[PDB]
C-alpha cells in the first residue's frame, strides 16, 4: 500500500487529434493534487492516438505504476484499447472518448463524454423542428462513425427522418471531395457529420464550397473553437451537440453543471486566453471531480496501491449518486456506464463566428 493515489493517463497529443488530447493533458493543472490528504500522482503519457501505443501505455500504469486508477485516450481507437487493458488488469478505468462499453468492458470502465443516444436526440429533435424530412450522413469508417450512424438510423428513423445518402472517410483523408459530390447530389434538408476535432472541419468546409444549402449538423467530438478557426464562415449556422461546459454562463444557477464549469473555464482561460474553452479539457477535469467523490469512500475500506482499493473505487462509482461535473451529473450503474441524463447537454449554433446556445 501506498500513501499516494496513483492515476495514469494516456491521451493523444500528437497526430491529427492533439486538438482533444492537448486540452486534456493542460487541464491537469487546474484538478486536485490530493484527496483525502493522500497526494495524486499524476503519470500522463502520448499515445498519438495510436491503440498500440494506448495499450503500452495502459500497462505501464497497471503494472510498472501499479495506478489505483486510469485515464484516457482522446478518441475511440486508444479508448477501447485502454478498457482492454483495464478489464483484464481490473483497474478502474475512467474513459475521455465515448467508446462503446460492451458486456466485456463494462465491469472496470465508465465513460466521461455523452453518450452518441443522449447527443443524437437534441440534434434529430431540432430536424424535427425545422422542416428536416430527409437526412445524409458523412463520418468515419471506424467504431465512431459507426456509432453515429447506427445511432441516426435506429433513433433518427424513428423520429421521422429519412435517410437518403450514407458516405465514409478515415481519420486521416484530408480530402472528402467524392462523398460531398454525392452528398451534394443527393440535396438531403440536412447533413450530420460523425467525426471529431480537425477532421469534423473538413466535411464542413467541403459541403459549404461544394454548394451544399442544408442544414449541418456535428457531434460532440467538434466542440472547440478550433472547429471555428478552421471552418470560418463555413461554420455559420452549424447545429452542434455539445456538453454545457461550452456555456456556463448562459445557466443558471440551479444547474449543478454550472459551478464546476465555471471554475475550470476561468481557470483554462486565463492561461491559454478567452473562448479557449472545450468539450476535451472538460472531461480530464470532470474525471478528477469523480475522484473527488469515490475516492474518499474508498479510503475508508481500502489503502491505496491494492486491489482492495481498486475494487472499492468500482463499486463507489456505482454507490455514489448524482455526481456534478462540468459536463453532466454522474449516476453510474453496474450496467449504465455513461451514467448521463439531459442535463449532461446543450445546443450549440454558430452565429458571428462565435458559439451561441440555441434556446
Ligand atoms: O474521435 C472520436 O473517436 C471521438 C471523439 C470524441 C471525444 C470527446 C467527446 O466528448 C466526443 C467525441
Ligand atoms: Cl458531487
Known sequence: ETNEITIGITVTTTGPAAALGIPERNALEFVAKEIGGHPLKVIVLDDGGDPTAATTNARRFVTESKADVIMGSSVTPPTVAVSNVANEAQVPHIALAPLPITPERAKWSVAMPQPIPIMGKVLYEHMKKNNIKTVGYIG???????????????????????????????????????????????????????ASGTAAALPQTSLRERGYKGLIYQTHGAASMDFIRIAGKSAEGVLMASGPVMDPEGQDDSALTKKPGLELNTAYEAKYGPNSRSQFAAHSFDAFKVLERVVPVALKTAKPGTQEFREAIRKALVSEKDIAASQGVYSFTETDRYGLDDRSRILLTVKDGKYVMVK
Open 140 to 194: 468515419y469508417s471506424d467504431s465512431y462513425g459507426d456509432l453515429w450512424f447506427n445511432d441516426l438510423k435506429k433513433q433518427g428513423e424513428a423520429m421521422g427522418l429519412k435517410i437518403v445518402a450514407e458516405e465514409r472517410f478515415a481519420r486521416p483523408d484530408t480530402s472528402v471531395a467524392g462523398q460531398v459530390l454525392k452528398l451534394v447530389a443527393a440535396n438531403p434538408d440536412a447533413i450530420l457529420v460523425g
